Each structure stands twice: as C-alpha cells, then as structure tokens.
Design a protein around this ligand. Structure first.
Ligand code: A4Y
Ligand code: A4Y
Ligand code: A4Y
Ligand code: MG
Ligand code: MG
Ligand code: MG
Ligand code: MG
Ligand code: MG
Ligand code: MG
Ligand code: MG
Ligand code: MG
Ligand code: MG
Lengths: 554, 554, 538
C-alpha cells in the first residue's frame, strides 16, 4: 500500500545474507548490469547476482567499470553500477568516479571493505575509501549498521540520479554483506514534483525578453534531459531566440531542428555562440552551472543574466545572476513560453553572425601521408550516421572532432570531458552498446589514450560488442607536445615508440586494420564498419598543422 | 659552510621558474630518473628536467609510474619519483601510492595542480588531491607559497625515506612552478644519529635470552635495511637464536647464510616460524610492525614479547610488548649481542621443527597439459639464479611461488604485497632493471594482473629493458574463483576469454613465446632468457590442485 | 558596482550592509580588528560579547526571528574554536548564522574550516582577495536559503587589510505544480484519519497565514516537532495534538500511528526519528522546500517540493469538505483534554520549600503573556516547561534544543530582545547552565537589555542525577556548591532577586518583571518529584 508498508511486493524479510538485500535493492532501481572485478570481501554480492536478472560483466581494470557505468547513466538517466572489491579494487575507481561526477553522469559504485571488526587496525585493506572518494563524488558512505543496508544503497542512487546527477560510492564491509540482515527493499522514488519558478519572476524575465534585442539561451547539462525536451523545443519555436550549448548539453539542440542554433561553446574562441553572448544584452541560462563553461571566458558583464535551473546559482565574480528562476525546468520554460508575446527579430550583427556560421559549414582533397586530420574527420563523417553512437577520447584528435562537430550526424556523441581524462572512449562505447546492442558504436582515441583502456578489448570480444575503435597514431602525447613547443620550443616526455595495432587488436580475437595509405582510409573504415563485432583501425596522422587549430582555443 | 648558509654550492638564487628550483632540489636528493606522464599544468617541470642529469621516463599509465618508483625506492633506499599532471593524472596514482605506503617503499609523487587563483572554483581540475592522497601516504601537502617550494619537496623525501619509509605526495600549482621564486636548495640530511635502547632495557632482554629456552627472532621491514645487515648477522652468530621473517623482511636473512632460519611467516599456517612462535617462550621482534603480519595469527600470548624498532610500538590486543627497545636498530642489536653469554641450545621440538623444515626441502615429473603449477615453479627455479631479480604479481601463482620461495636463489625478490594489488610485477621489474640495467629481471603474473599494466611493455621496449615476463594463463581470475568455489560451489565474475599473448607481445616490438606443450616449457624459458630485451612467455596452467595449497593458508 | 576598496574589510562591511545586518556579535583581535575598524564607518552596530560561544547563540536568535542570518565576528585561533558549540547548536535547530572568523596571513599558513565543516551548512576560507564578496554572499545564501543553517567564513589577515577589486552582491521558489496538489487533495478526501506533522519550515512566518487557512478548511488534526513548537498551539486550534519527540503519552504520537494518511509539512526525519511514529501503514506526503531526506522509515509516496506558503494555499483551495473525526481520533483528543486537565491540578503547593516545579511553572505562566518572549535553557526545568508548553501563551518560545546545549537561554534572550527591544524577554535556566553563559550579564547591563532571567537552583546537574539514580541508585559528578545569585547579579550592575520564601516568588517575579532592565531571580526548587515526570519520557 504505502511506500514503507511492512506488507507488499517489497516484503520485510529475514535475509540470509546482506548481499541478497543489496541485490534486491538493485533490482528495484532498475539496474540491468553490473561492471567490475570480484574479490574475497565482495564476492558474495557477485554470487547473489547469479540468482538475479542483473547481468554480471567482468572488466579487466576497475577504472573502466566506472567509465562504462557513466555511459549507461548518461543514456538511460538511471545510474550505472560498478562493483569492486576492497583496497586497490576501490582506489582503482577514483579517476573514473571523478570523470563521472564532473560530467554529471549518474554512477553508483559498490566497493567491498574489510570486516567491521578489522577496521580498527591495519589489515590487508585498512583503506579509508570514504575519505578518498568524498572529494570526487556527490555521495560517499560506508554501511556500518546492517539495518541501514538497503537505505544506504537507495540513497546512493537517489544522490546519483536526482538534482544535478553525479557519482556515488558505497563501502560494504564483508561481514555486513555475508551476515544476515532484517529489512525491506525501498521502492525507487522518481523526481520531486517541483513547481516552476514564481510567476512574479517569470513575468519579470518575460518582460526582459521583450525589452531585449540580442537575447540568447545558454543551455547546460540539465537542458539536455528528456524531461525538458518538449518544453525546450516549444520555448524555442515561440521565441525564436538563438541558442548555444555547453558540451554537457551538446545534444539538447541540434542544428538540423532549430535554425538559430549558434553551436557549442566552451572550447573555441571563435564561435557564433561566443559572439552572441558577448553581443547579448540578455543571457538566459537553462540547466547551466558555471563549472560547465567558466563564466570568466564568456560573461563580459554588460548583459542581464537569468538563471534557470533545478538548483539556486552558486554566485561568483563572473556569474552573479540578476534574476534567478529556481524550480522544475520544464515547468519554468512552459510558463515562460506562455508570456512570449512575439518572436524575436534578429539584429543585423546577430543575424550576420548566424549567417557567417552557416556559410562556413580541403576535406577529402588531401592524399598526403600521414593522413591530414581534416581528412580523417571527413572519413569519420561518412561512416557516422544517425544510427551510430560516437565516443571521443581526449587528445589533439578531440579538438579536431570538436571543431567539426556540427558536421557529424550521430544519434548520440560522448565527447564532453571536463576532467580531460584519457582512455574514456572505448569503455564509453562498450557501455553505450550494452544499452542499445542493436546499433553500431564508433570510438576514437589516440595511441596514448588507447593503451590506458585497451585492456577492455577482451571485454568487447567476450561481449561481442559491435564497437569500431579508431586510433589516431602519432607515437606520442601530441596534445601535450604542442603546448611544450609553443611555450618552450622543445619537447619533454611526449614521445614513445611505435606499435603494430593491427596485430594488437587481432591478439584479442578482434578484427584489426592499418591504414597504409591515404587512399586506403575510406576503404578500410568501410570494411571495419561492416564487421559485426569489435574492430580496431590504426590511422597514422600528421599533426603538423595542429598549432593553427589550437590558436582558436581559449 | 652550515647546512642553511646563504653562500655555498647551494646558492640562494632568483629562480626564473619554480620548476628550476624543484629540479635542483631533486638533484640534491640523488634522484636519477622520473617516471610519469606530462601535462599542461606540470609541463614546466618536465621541461626543466631537460637541462638536468635526471632522466625522463614516460610511462603509459600513471599508476605504473608509482609502481616503478616503489621498486627504485626499495632497492636504493632513496625515494623513487613519479611526476604527473593535475586531475586524472594525480588520481591515477592513488592505488600505486597506497601499495608503496603499505610495503614501506619510499616514493615521492609530484603532481601538478591548477593555478592557485583557480582553486577557489570548479575548473578542469578542481580536484582536492591532498584530501585524496592523505589516507594512503605518510605525507601529502600542496605548495601554496612559492618560498616553501624547496622546503616542501625536501620534506617529502624526508617523510618518504626516514623512519618507517612510505609514500609522499606533493601538489604543485601551475603558477608556482612557472613563476619566479627566491630560495635555495636544502641539502639532504641522512638518518638521525639515534642511540640504542637504554642499557637497563637491553640487559633486561639479555637476561630474558638466558632464561629463555625457545627464543626466536621475528624480523620486520626495517631489519632488511642495509644499515642493520652487519649488526643482525653478528647477533645471529653469537646467539644462534632461530629467525623467521615477514615478507617485508623476506631478504634480511637467507637460508644459505644462517642454518636456523625458519622461513617466512604471514601467508601459510604450516611454517616452521609459526610453530617456533607458538612454541616460543620469548619472541624478539626486530624492525617489525603489526601491519606486516597480524599478531592475532601468531601471538598466542603465552610468551614474553620484546619490541626492537626505530619507533615505539602501537600497542593492541595481540601486540602488547612486555619490553620495548626503541632506538637505532643496529646499535641496539650490537649492544644486545655484547650481553649474549652463550649460544642457544635448541630444544628437541625446536630442533625437530627445523629438521622437518629442511627434510621437506613431483617437481619435473609432470608432463601434463596444461602445465601443473609445481612444474612451472621448477622451471622458474632453473632460470632464476643469483644474478636475476624476481618480481611476483598477485594471484594463485603468487601462492605457489611463495610456497617454494626457499628454493629460489634470486639476488632480490619483490613479492610482498599487503594491499594485494594486481599488475605490479612488470612495472616493478622495469624499475628494478633501471637501477641495475646490467642484470636480468624476471617478472611473473597472471593473465588478469598482466593486462592491468601490460601497457608498459611499450615502455620496456623503448627502454630496451632486459625483462622476461611470464604469464600463467588460465583465462580467469583464479585466486578469486577458488574462494567462490569453496564458499558457494559456483563462480561469479571470474571467467574471461583467451588471448594470443605471443602476438600480443610481438605487437609491442618485444619477443613473444607460447608454451604449447609441457615438454616445451624449459626450452622456451631458456630461449626467452637468452633474449637481450623484453620478452613475454604465455604458460597455460592447470589450477585443479589449487584447493589443496590454499588450505595451507591463514 | 565595482569599486576600488582600500581594505578588504571595507568590501566585507558593505556586503553585510547589503544583507541587512543590523548588528554584529563577537570579540576583536589582531587578525580581524580591521573588520571591527571598518564597522565604525558603517550603520552596523558592534556588540562586544564576553565569550565567543555566546555570539553564536545571540546570532541564532536574531536569525530565527528575522529570517536573515545573525552575524558573529571573531579573531583567529581560540576566537574561532570558541564558536564551534554555538555554531553546532544553530545548525541543528535551523537558525541562519554567519560567522566571520579571522585567520593568519596567507603566507603564514589552526585548520578552522576542517573543524567547522561537521557542524555547519557551509565552511570556506577566502584565499583569493577577488572572491571576498562572493564568499560572504554565498555564506548568507547557504545560511538563509533552503533549510537554514550556520555558515563559517575564514578571513586571512592580509586579505581584509590589503586592497581588493570587486563589487557588492545584492541580496525564491514557486508553489508545487497544480497536478500534484490535485493528487494530494484527492488523498485527503479518501482519508479517514489524516494528520499533519509539522516540521521546522512550517514555523517560518512566511507560512503562518497559509498554514492557518489550510487548517481551517481541512480541520485535520495537527502535531508538531519541537522545532515547529510555535507554528500551532492548543489555544488557537482545537484539534492540536501537542508536540511529539519528548513525551511518551502525547496525542500526536497516537494519531500518527493511527493515521491512514500523514502529510508532513516542512519536516525532516532529524527532527523526530521516523522509526517512532511511521508504522508504514499510511500514505505519506512530503511538503517542504527541499526533497525528502529519505531513509528506512521515511519513503514518502508523494513529494511536493517548492514554496510551502503557495503550496498550502493552493491545497486549501482544493479541500472540498472538513474532516469528520473518527472515534479513536476523537477519543485521543478527548484523552489529551483530560490529560491536560490532569496535568493541571489545581493544588495549593503543600511543599512550599523548596518551591515545587509546578509552582514555578504557574508563576512563569502568569508573567509570560502574549507580549513576552520565553527562552528556555537545558535541564530538568526544560522537561517541566515542555510538559506544559500548551499552557504558555508566549509571543515566541525558544526551547527546541536537539544538541541539548546548556547555557543557551540568556544569550538567546539578549539576541531576541535586540530584534524587538520594546518588549520583555524571559529566560530560564538552571544553576549549571547559568554559569556557562552568565558572563553575558555584563553585556545585558551594557546593552540595557530588558531581560528577566530565572534560575532554578538545586546546586547540581539534576537532569543527569535523575538519570544516574534510575540506572545506578547513586550519584557521580552531579553536585556542586551553593551560590548567592542575588549579589552575583548585583555585582554586574543588574537588579538581583532572591526568592526567600514560597509566598515571595510571584511578588518577586512581579517586581522583577517591573524592572526595566536586566534582572535575575534565584528560585530554589525541589526536584523530588522529577522521577514522576521523567517516567513520561521515551
Ligand atoms: C587491483 C585489484 N583488483 C581486484 C583484486 C586485486 N587487485 N587482487 C586480487 C586479490 C589478491 O585481492 C584477491 C585475493 O583475489 C582478493 O580479491 O582478495 S588478485 C587477483 C588478480 C587476478 O587474477 P590473475 O589472473 O592475475 O591470477 P590467477 O589467480 O593466476 O588467475 C584478483 C582479481 N583480486 C582482487
Ligand atoms: C589520465 C591523464 N593523464 C594525463 C593527461 C590526461 N589524462 N589528459 C591529457 C590532457 C587533456 O589533460 C592535456 C591537455 O594534454 C593536459 O595535460 O592538459 S590528454 C593527453 C592524452 C595522450 O595523448 P594521445 O596519444 O592519446 O592523443 P594525441 O594528442 O592525438 O597524441 C595527455 C597526455 N594529457 C594529460
Ligand atoms: C554543554 C553541556 N554539557 C554537558 C551537558 C549538557 N550540555 N546537556 C545536559 C543534557 C541535556 O545533555 C543531559 C540530559 O543532562 C545529558 O547529559 O544527557 S543538560 C544538563 C544541565 C543540568 O544542570 P542545570 O543546573 O543547568 O539544570 P538543573 O537540571 O535544573 O540542575 C547537564 C549538565 N547536561 C550534560
Ligand atoms: Mg545474474
Ligand atoms: Mg563529496
Ligand atoms: Mg598520440
Ligand atoms: Mg634530463
Ligand atoms: Mg597520511
Ligand atoms: Mg588468471
Ligand atoms: Mg523563523
Ligand atoms: Mg558541512
Ligand atoms: Mg542545577
């Protein structure tokens, strides 16, 4: 009957093992799989998952379990789950949990721990994981009372999925998950029934839209959630105000569904969105937090600033909103749309800025070897259609793809990377494929980022994941090298040796390719896409022109 | 003149870049190389190292920089150095720093950080690294004042190398290492001139040795340091008291130089050392901390307990020493040796226990496929001579090697692993080889542990490291599986797919081998040893008999 | 506007003015004396206290009444650490408090931020002079917004002394969605034993009118935690079931366990452990400014997050009919009426010496009318007053004390009086709690605060003694010596009163009330009957 009744499909049982209650709680959360590596302290949860519909997916390095979990979280909106053992099993997650928290990806990590009695000493894993995960999670707690077992797990998903999503860590002592517990599953509660910002405030902003002549919407992470899709589109059609998005909101609005989309901001200093922002007399931020794009780089201060989000702003020097609309975003945008009396008439400069953007949007006329980056971007465009997901690692290739991200027509793109973690592309792709295994996923990284997570190629083969991984090969850490060259005119620690990435992939049981010539790139990628399973393509790249592109950055 | 004079070979300069002072301080510490991966926030230290005798060694994953650094620290006694950039560059070190701290390996990690002005916000790397490293280091601090730059680095090496050694982390904001500083290098101070434990106390223990009839020495980490080698041997010869060692002291005393060595304790429940400890009426711990071997597993409480170490004991339930000798170990053992009036006369049981140990110390008469573990141990014994270093990863193979560690005659063995971190063997071997590049290093791991650090095979080829890596291949996480089988009679998350490890190694430019038959093992290892560079040998293993060996554990 | 400030302290003070700060409590020191100095050029009033802990107490009273954070200003080192207990008490009770604590120069860097984090909503140190106004503004925002709490800001000496470039930052939710209020209105109709459980936020002044309208159109019975002890009383709502959390014989507890629908307003599980009232056999509705802090025994079926006042008004508009009490509900409320009658006597205090507690309570009731504020310290007297809260007709009562800190009454009263100095404030404490903050009698005299302080004198820590007697039948560490509190109060320059006889307390309290300034009244009490009252506790 009630949510906390002692008689329901969620009965109050005498559980033989706390792990059984943990697994039942996961089922209530809608968890479909678990990523991680087992160990003695946590093997009972792995064991209990055998009697569950939840799928166990062993990875080869815990860090990639956190990466896969984040991809699951971003796509589905419900937290991806990592499951690791105590000690180095937990500490191997920290970078992944930070990357998830930075991007707003809901992730729950369940980490084993020594028996409670052994915490008062120095044993094989006397590791204070809560203290280590606290700085890089929304939520980190250890279950010290077996009664609070289901409560702690439920609160972890609640912290990860609600508000501005983030990562959550739960430490599970061995004796708690092995021993008996008395409790019940806590059914999952959705989002709060939040009200729109107050009418006196939305009318105030509506009056600013009329009085404004160069208004622009700045979309943040929360603007890209599905709950706000319909409301956001309805507001853009009735207002016709131009829009620009951070990379955490890179998918909220595409150029092909809204004519006045001004591109993505946060990376390049020559974007239509940037010019419209500095030109703007009214900026309305939707679902945006300053962390997504430092306000010091776009807020000139000569414009009225409106904040629309599920949480109050964290005021700062270059982000002191004059009006603050706090509440349900969808409800706020709907009420705001009701008070739009007329559609915007673009100013000459504003209109010219959008024209200049579309006029820009070389190429394939570049048979040089090694392949020029702009050529690789073109070949990627031809294979990444609306049915393919694209995951992008971190490096110089990342900047090239971001520069031409308007031209990719992918169903979804995972590229946003505030922490700038390398090695994310491949595990992101495996997680994304598991959500929609009927579709193709294309992951792209450098040779540096590739080897930090290439161990998961074995996981991809074992899963038969339909993932095509592209490696831009330069035998170095180029994105760092270019910075050293500009600053010091010499390189330090950015060069390493070559590899036979074709045979490397084949040793995992996957299909390997190596672009030997500029004419062989399209034939090779074409063949690699047609592979019904894991495939890797090594693409020698010539980064000589990188200094030209990097000068366009902030 | 004085250590802090403003006029000396360590002059007070106006440094153009804090990084220059950092590098000069490293030179004063005797640092020969630096392991890590560069980045924008820290690239000035990499740049400054170009003008230095210190060698830059790029790795492919930061975690392995911490592992290599630990090996350097254990062998030389001076801290190995890791150098990483901010954000995920630092968080990727945490597991390695914990493994170093647990084993007492001196390691200094220098991690980049955002500008000081950008710490008061959420930027690309607003990561509180000090809070994350504190639980797994002896020392973690961030340089906020450029004047304290050399002080902080000096104190990091001091914390790492002195007392019970450990890992230390220093966070270096970008503006501090890029901007100018005014300071001087701090010359390195050796160990304190400590005095022996008080005479009234050493005589008290000397009187206990006489009154004792089953005394035994329990050697800990500090007993294996070179400063105590001569004193320890002199005490064992004049006393002839039996000796047993933790694995952190596995090298302090070898069976071939002392007849009454009772093996290593901490892993197996059927060791001569264990029987002598439970039989003992007097246990003298030298350089030992309870963390090395839980006193609950060997201290029955029916024996007088003496503590000899550079630090006071941390009393606990099963470790309340009756006598406490605190001071310089070497000086304490020397004074104690002066008061030995006669050599011990072994008791019948004590003598019988040592006889039973030597009588034990199958084999090669096992042509079964896959190769029986005991056969692999024999083939390893034939190639690991006194000129070879042996590094051992974590897994079921680890238990087999530990069971027969008396039979290996290696110059040095790195096997101790309290945190039980997998992936340590290969990076340990690269670090060890760099200290003595004229010698051969043999590293052994499983297929699970191999892929967590196999990325460093590229580093080994690039370094031309004379490292032979052996993989016990079972296509699973066996050491975990055996625990699940005994506890639940079913497996969960411990199986993965096969790989062509021969071609895998060859893709890095290294020599690859695959033992196809039991008769080919010795021929293959023989050939792989004769390789003058990196080589990998895949060894299919049959773990069917593992349950028999694991029953001999605590 | 952006201004070129000569000293960071100038920007701090201007930011405080923008926040509406009327006074600052604290003690100056070298690291922070520039903020004290800058306050001379400000309309803000400097109120020196005699112990920093009491600055946090006074600040909390200002915060609770006005809704804008009270401000404490202390120097580095022990100046900050002396605040921790006060800041913890403010955070626990939901009182908005901003503490500005000095710190050594940045170049010379007690880790105060680490020490205040566990007992504050917000703790930060200003390391960049540019972010000075940002941090102060965010501190007030953290303290005053959402569920209010305490906030700490560490100000390095060089930051407030040196020049800064910045601007002042000038100083709001909508009602729950209509589709969600229609959902709740339908549940009230189908319900037959509904009850409101009021929490902290239901007691805020913004929700007073809306709450009354909801109770009038619904006539649903009400029970309150002690953080909401003032939102509703027995004399203004007939179906008030008392306050829950302290006594084991309250109508509110019985109605909650009987309820088939519980609507919590402004409530967090921390105010009253849900394990003691949520049986799980009822639909649970959560109405608050924040999402529910879910736990085992608190998984609401409906969650209304938004402006409480706007939500309750809209909900009251959709109530089609008034509740018809069930027999048990009516009987429970009847039993409370009979209980209140039994709690009353009337009795002629046969044991005149020492004065019986019930006699002191009546004498307090006669002087605490609707124009008087009452602050209550912690001790056995606290239980007595809590037992008879229904009978007090005070303008405001400060009694809620989850941390159970002693010494709060007097500084609470001084802070409360400063908000409305034209009214009388009555503070009551024990002899133990009195001496932990009695130093502020000098502040009261120096301020001419119209505060009447009552001391229940037993020469011991009674509330602990009674616990020891029940557990061990012997006392340990709960006895101390007597004091002549009349001369004690008079030595501060305040009026001192000593209840010499049982007939003189009302004459004395009457005379002490007629004092237009600080007054202290020592009241010898006979706690012999305490075991009878304490048996009524959980
Ligand atoms: C970072 C980290 N993450 C997780 C664990 C780990 N390190 N260490 C182990 C350990 C020692 O911790 C223990 C005993 O398995 C355990 O879980 O308690 S080793 C082990 C290594 C894989 O096995 P591998 O193939 O290499 O060896 P075989 O046994 O021969 O097959 C396993 C998965 N562990 C958990
Ligand atoms: C965990 C971690 N450790 C260290 C860094 C990292 N992640 N991210 C980068 C970054 C983005 O952080 C930045 C800009 O290079 C930097 O240092 O600031 S990416 C980069 C990845 C290697 O380059 P790769 O071969 O893959 O790509 P190419 O550029 O095409 O050659 C580099 C080494 N970084 C530092
Ligand atoms: C800071 C602090 N330090 C210590 C305690 C405290 N606060 N609070 C109390 C408390 C409520 O906490 C409890 C119930 O006594 C307890 O210990 O649990 S109050 C209480 C005050 C009783 O003495 P007092 O003379 O003031 O009142 P009478 O009862 O009339 O005599 C007692 C000393 N406490 C412990
Ligand atoms: Mg399953
Ligand atoms: Mg956190
Ligand atoms: Mg590269
Ligand atoms: Mg060099
Ligand atoms: Mg530490
Ligand atoms: Mg294996
Ligand atoms: Mg209030
Ligand atoms: Mg806090
Ligand atoms: Mg008292």
């Amino acid at each position: 009957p009630r949510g906390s009744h002692m008689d329901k499909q969620y009965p109050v049982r005498q559980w033989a093992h706390g792990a059984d209650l943990v697994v039942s709680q996961l089922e209530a959360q809608g968890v479909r799989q678990v990523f991680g590596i087992p160990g003695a302290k946590i093997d009972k949860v792995f064991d209990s998952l055998l009697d569950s519909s939840i799928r166990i997916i062993p990875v080869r390095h815990e860090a990639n379990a956190a990466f896969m979990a984040a991809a699951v979280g971003r796509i589905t909106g419900k937290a991806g789950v990592a499951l690791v053992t105590s000690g180095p099993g937990c500490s191997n997650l920290i970078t992944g949990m930070a990357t998830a928290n930075s991007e707003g990806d809901p992730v729950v990590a369940l980490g084993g721990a020594v028996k409670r009695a052994d915490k008062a000493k120095q044993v094989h894993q006397s590791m204070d994981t809560v203290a280590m995960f606290s700085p890089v999670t929304k939520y980190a707690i250890e279950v010290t009372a077996p009664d609070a077992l289901a409560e702690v797990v439920s609160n972890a998903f609640r912290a990860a999925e609600q508000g501005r999503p983030g990562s959550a860590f739960v430490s599970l002592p061995q004796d708690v998950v092995d021993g008996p517990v008395s409790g019940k599953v806590l059914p999952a509660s959705g989002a709060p029934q939040m009200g729109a910002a107050p009418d006196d405030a939305i009318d105030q902003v509506a009056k600013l839209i009329a009085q404004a002549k160069n208004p622009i919407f700045l979309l943040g992470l929360m603007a890209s959630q599905p709950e706000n899709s319909k409301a956001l589109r309805r507001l853009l059609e009735t207002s016709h105000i131009p829009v620009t998005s951070t990379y955490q909101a890179a998918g909220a609005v595409n150029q092909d569904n809204f004519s006045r989309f001004a591109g993505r901001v946060g990376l390049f200093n020559n974007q239509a969105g940037d010019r419209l922002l500095q030109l703007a007399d009214l900026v309305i931020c939707i679902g945006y937090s300053p962390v997504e794009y430092e306000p010091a780089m776009w807020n000139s201060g000569n414009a009225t600033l409106v904040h629309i989000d599920v949480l109050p702003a964290y005021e700062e020097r270059n982000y002191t909103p004059d009006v603050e609309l706090v509440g349900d975003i969808a409800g706020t945008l709907n009420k705001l749309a009701q008070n739009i009396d007329h559609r915007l008439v673009l100013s000459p400069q504003a209109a010219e800025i959008l024209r200049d953007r579309q006029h820009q949007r070389r190429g394939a006329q570049l048979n040089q070897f090694a392949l020029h980056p702009l050529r690789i971007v073109r070949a990627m465009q031809d294979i990444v259609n609306s049915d393919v997901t694209l995951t992008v690692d971190m490096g110089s290739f990342h900047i090239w793809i971001a520069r031409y991200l308007y031209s990719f027509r992918a169903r979804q793109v995972m590229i946003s990377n505030g922490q700038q973690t390398m090695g994310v592309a491949l595990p992101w792709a495996i997680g994304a494929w598991l959500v929609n295994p009927e579709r193709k996923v294309v992951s792209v990284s450098g040779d540096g980022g590739f080897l930090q997570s290439s161990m998961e190629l074995e996981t991809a083969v074992r899963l038969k994941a339909n993932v095509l991984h592209l490696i831009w090969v330069d035998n170095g850490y180029n994105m760092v090298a270019i910075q050293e060259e500009k600053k010091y005119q010499r390189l330090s620690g950015v060069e390493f040796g070559p590899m036979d990435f074709k045979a490397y992939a084949e040793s995992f049981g996957a299909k390997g390719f190596a672009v030997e010539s500029a004419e062989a790139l399209e034939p090779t990628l074409r063949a690699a896409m047609d592979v019904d399973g894991p495939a890797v393509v090594a693409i020698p790249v010539d980064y000589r022109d990188n200094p030209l592109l990097m000068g366009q950055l902030h």
